[PDB]
Design an enzyme around this catalytic site. Structure first.
Site, PDB file in Angstrom:
ATOM      1  N   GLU A 417       0.825  -1.204   0.000  1.00 49.62           N
ATOM      2  CA  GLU A 417       0.000   0.000   0.000  1.00 49.62           C
ATOM      3  C   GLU A 417       0.863   1.259   0.000  1.00 49.62           C
ATOM      4  O   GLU A 417       0.727   2.117  -0.874  1.00 49.62           O
ATOM      5  CB  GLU A 417      -0.940   0.001   1.198  1.00 49.62           C
ATOM      6  N   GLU A 490       7.630  -4.197   6.380  1.00 46.40           N
ATOM      7  CA  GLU A 490       8.542  -3.137   5.952  1.00 46.40           C
ATOM      8  C   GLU A 490       8.821  -2.263   7.161  1.00 46.40           C
ATOM      9  O   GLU A 490       7.896  -1.642   7.697  1.00 46.40           O
ATOM     10  CB  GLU A 490       7.934  -2.322   4.807  1.00 46.40           C
ATOM     11  CG  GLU A 490       8.836  -1.233   4.250  1.00 46.40           C
ATOM     12  CD  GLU A 490       8.190  -0.481   3.101  1.00 46.40           C
ATOM     13  OE1 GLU A 490       7.226  -1.018   2.516  1.00 46.40           O
ATOM     14  OE2 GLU A 490       8.639   0.643   2.784  1.00 46.40           O
TER      15      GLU A 490
END
Ligand SMILES: *[C@@H]1C[C@@H](O)[C@@H](O)[C@@H](CO)O1
Ligand SMILES: [Ca+2]
Length: 837
Positions: A417, A490
């Protein structure tokens, strides 16, 4: 020169012609390409063009353009009746393929493998010409992609009756409980009958250790007869009982070859091999990840695809070197952000024992976003995945088909995203043996779309990745969604240069286009390395972390990033990233040894920063220099030796406290009286030492309060005030390489004083003289704002180091590399090249 001498799948990289041009039309075989460049693939035609501030910082200011590849070759008469196909592991991007003047089709996505059948248009017994047009209009992407045929190309030659491309799927559904004894393998094999007569075939399938002979098989089976109509295909199911297979694990990556023979009577028509490993994984909502029933913390890094000064070229040795440098850090997992890896990376991780989270997409103006949701034209004969819906399904299934048997791949990542539910269903239908996932950024804000999308992942056996969550947010997810198996997809995004010490702060644009090497610099939405790991190592429900990034990459030079054209700051502007733990040249930054102290349980770490020269250190209050020690030892004693003295004096001593989680993971934190008020910074040790010429050295003690032998640990156990630059020290990582025109030798050159100490700020221009059976293919110093050509024979060192990459030829011999610098003593290395047997 294609004939029957070559293997079923053979290397097709050599002897292409290339031309960069937006106007030529070179698809016809009779096109005169005698003035074109002669290149061996893989090839990147962006990396050799000049930087320009009219380009975009996010893609390293390098242009793209339209590139044409041509190859004229012979198809011998002995291949008459055979099926021939060309396979592209990756072409960036928007490829168009002609064969003998006939358009075969197109492939938009720059990161997924694909193939074309050549049989229908082949001239058997004559000259043939394959043409590939590549188009990279450079609005492009958020990072440097490169342009062209940047991955290997192969030819597949088979009989008319043959196993389909990536035609064998292997499942061991009961491995977790059959482990040690007879293991059930369920195989599905696609067999194509591309003849004009009905085929009645059987399969003989064999599982034997990789590199061995079939007489060492742990299991074989012969199937019953299967009829296959002319021009039709069939899925042949079969079961093999494997007798006590060796498991594939991180420490013992045991590999097997599964060989499938298509027989007609007693005659073998086709032999297809696929690489396999026996292993099973698990994601538990409370205790995290497991491999082969044993708990493992995912110590991972995100890795972009480019190889530094080589650009996007997926050279196998360059990729292998990256993984080896990561393994020395203690990395056990790689996330291929944000696109399918080269097959070479999957091969390396299969062999080296690294877990791969293979991402397939980034997001879901002329880029792939136009093609993501479009159907494939009926006259586009591109092959690789399902063609009945959208390009996204084709590229997703093409990647899964290539890698479905690779033991290193543990998870399919769908993006970073309506569309989400479709991708998840496509992935589960394509390969039910692995969980799917993606990195979601908006889980922090707890959007209603993130709650829904996370539950939909879990309902389909998937794993939820959260991007840039801190400890509090990890706990909120765990409390709000007790059924989710989560991990840090991440994390960190610390921004640092290599060898910068005259300030300990960062996180923003500086004045020298560099950033501090202390772990106190991160982007606003990220965290420093110690903070991102402290939050993960405490929580068993956070299965692991994927640090952004493992290596610096070209493009996205945040905090000097920029969408749109124009230089960011004064030209030359920073053109590669600062996120990497290792720089683009393969030279570790200082935080490499923090991670190694946290992750690598096979080595001991003892690393001191800063380098101890007055013109590079930072003087704070009282002219004290912050001294940081990264180590895995229980206790550290710090010493100082004045310049010109042989006796050291103790200047401090600090012991770590060991913590253990419920699952059994252990980590160390400093709880002394003078500890830092920020808890995560106490994962390492800090002293404030007054500046003076001399040596700061450290001794490591174990839990029994006894000395660890000096020199046996990794990192700079001492730092000394150096003299002026006096000589170069060159060293080739491998002193013998393969004479195949592919193998590389990496030559690090250090600028040192008369006593061999690296001059920490040295930037002398080093010239490389390469003679013999090799060629210089790249020079690098990892410095983001350096715009000197990667293809030059010279480059300034940065922070005392410079790199030269030499490539072998196809003739065995010797390579001589002399590194020269004005006023300095030269250094010469010799690399032998050995012919291919
Ligand atoms: C996560 C996504 C990745 O592509 C990078 O842009 C990174 C920058 O911090 O954030
Ligand atoms: Ca260790």
């Amino acid at each position: 020169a294609v004939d029957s001498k070559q293997n079923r799948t053979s290397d097709f990289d050599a002897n292409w012609k290339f031309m960069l041009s937006d106007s030529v039309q070179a698809q016809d075989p009779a096109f005169d390409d005698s003035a074109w460049q002669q290149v061996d693939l893989p090839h990147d035609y962006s990396i050799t063009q000049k930087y320009s501030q009219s380009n975009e910082a996010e893609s390293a200011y390098l242009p793209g353009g339209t590139g044409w590849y041509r190859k004229s070759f012979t198809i011998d008469r002995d291949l008459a009746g055979k099926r021939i196909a060309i396979n592209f592991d990756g072409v960036y991007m928007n490829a168009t393929v002609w064969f003998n003047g006939v358009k075969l089709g197109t492939h938009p996505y720059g990161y997924s493998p694909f193939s074309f059948d050549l049989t229908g248009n082949a001239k058997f017994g004559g000259e043939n010409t394959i043409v590939v047009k590549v188009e990279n209009r450079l609005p492009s992407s958020r990072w440097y992609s490169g342009s062209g045929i940047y991955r290997d190309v192969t030819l597949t030659v088979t009989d008319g009756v043959h196993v389909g491309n990536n035609g064998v799927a292997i499942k061991t559904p009961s491995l977790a409980t059959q482990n040690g004894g007879d293991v059930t393998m369920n195989l599905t094999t696609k067999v194509a009958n591309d003849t004009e007569a009905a085929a009645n075939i059987t399969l003989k399938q064999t599982v034997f250790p990789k590199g061995g002979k079939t007489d060492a098989a742990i299991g074989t089976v012969t199937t019953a007869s299967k009829s296959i109509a002319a021009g039709a295909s069939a899925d042949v199911t079969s079961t093999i009982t494997a007798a006590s297979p060796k498991l594939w694990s991180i420490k013992n990556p045991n590999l097997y070859t599964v060989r499938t023979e298509v027989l007609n009577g007693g005659k073998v028509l086709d032999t297809y091999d696929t690489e396999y490993g026996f292993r099973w994984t698990g994601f538990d909502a409370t205790s995290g990840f497991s491999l082969n029933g044993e708990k493992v913390k995912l110590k991972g890094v995100s890795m972009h695809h480019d190889q530094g000064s080589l650009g996007a070229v997926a050279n196998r040795r360059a990729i292998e070197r990256q993984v080896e440098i990561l393994q020395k850090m203690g990395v056990n997992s790689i996330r291929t952000t944000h696109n399918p890896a080269a097959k070479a990376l999957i091969d390396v991780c299969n062999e080296k024992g690294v877990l791969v989270v293979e991402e397939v997409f980034d997001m879901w103006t002329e880029d792939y976003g136009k093609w993501f949701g479009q159907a494939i034209a009926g006259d586009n004969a591109v092959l690789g995945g399902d063609k009945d819906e959208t390009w996204a399904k084709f590229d997703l299934t093409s990647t899964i088909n290539r890698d479905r048997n690779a033991p290193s791949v543990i998870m399919w990542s769908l993006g970073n995203e309506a569309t989400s539910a479709k991708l998840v269903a496509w992935t589960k239908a394509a390969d039910s043996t692995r969980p799917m996932t993606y990195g979601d950024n908006k889980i922090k804000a707890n959007w209603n779309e993130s709650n829904t999308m996370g539950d939909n992942l879990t309902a389909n056996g998937g794993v939820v990745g959260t991007n840039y969550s801190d400890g509090a947010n990890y706990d909120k997810i765990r409390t709000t969604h007790p059924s989710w198996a989560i991990y840090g997809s991440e994390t960190a995004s610390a921004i640092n240069s290599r060898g910068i010490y005259n300030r300990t702060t960062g996180g923003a644009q500086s004045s020298d286009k560099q950033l501090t090497s202390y772990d106190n610099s991160a982007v606003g939405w990220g965290a420093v390395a110690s903070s991102a790991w402290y939050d993960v190592v405490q929580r068993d429900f956070v299965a692991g972390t994927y640090v952004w990034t493992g290596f610096d990459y070209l493009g996205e030079p945040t905090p000097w990033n920029g969408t749109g054209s124009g230089a960011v700051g004064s030209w030359p502007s920073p053109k590669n990233s600062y996120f990497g733990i290792v720089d683009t040249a393969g030279f570790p930054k200082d935080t490499y040894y923090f991670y190694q102290s946290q992750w690598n349980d096979d080595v001991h770490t003892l690393h001191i920063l800063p380098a101890w020269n007055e013109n590079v250190v930072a003087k704070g209050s009282g002219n004290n220099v912050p001294v940081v020690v990264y180590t895995d030892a229980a206790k550290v004693k710090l010493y100082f030796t004045p310049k010109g003295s042989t006796e050291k004096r103790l200047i401090g001593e600090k012991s770590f406290t060991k913590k253990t989680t419920a699952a059994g993971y252990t980590y160390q934190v400093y709880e002394g009286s003078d500890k830092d008020s920020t808890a995560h910074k106490n994962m390492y040790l800090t002293w404030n030492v007054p500046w003076a010429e001399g040596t700061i050295s450290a001794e490591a003690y174990d839990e029994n309060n006894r000395l660890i032998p000096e020199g046996s640990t990794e990192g700079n156990a001492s730092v000394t005030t150096t003299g002026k630059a006096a000589k170069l020290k060159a060293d080739a990582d491998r002193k013998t390489i393969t004479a195949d025109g592919k193998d590389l030798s990496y030559i690090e050159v250090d600028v040192t004083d008369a006593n061999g100490h690296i001059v920490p700020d040295a930037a002398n221009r080093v010239t490389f003289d390469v003679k013999g059976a090799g060629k210089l293919v790249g020079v690098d110093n990892g410095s983001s704002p350096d715009h000197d050509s990667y293809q030059a024979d010279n480059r300034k060192a940065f922070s005392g180091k410079v790199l030269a990459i030499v490539q072998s030829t196809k003739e065995a011999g010797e390579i001589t590399v002399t590194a020269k610098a004005d006023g300095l003593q030269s250094s010469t290395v010799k690399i032998a090249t050995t012919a291919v047997p």
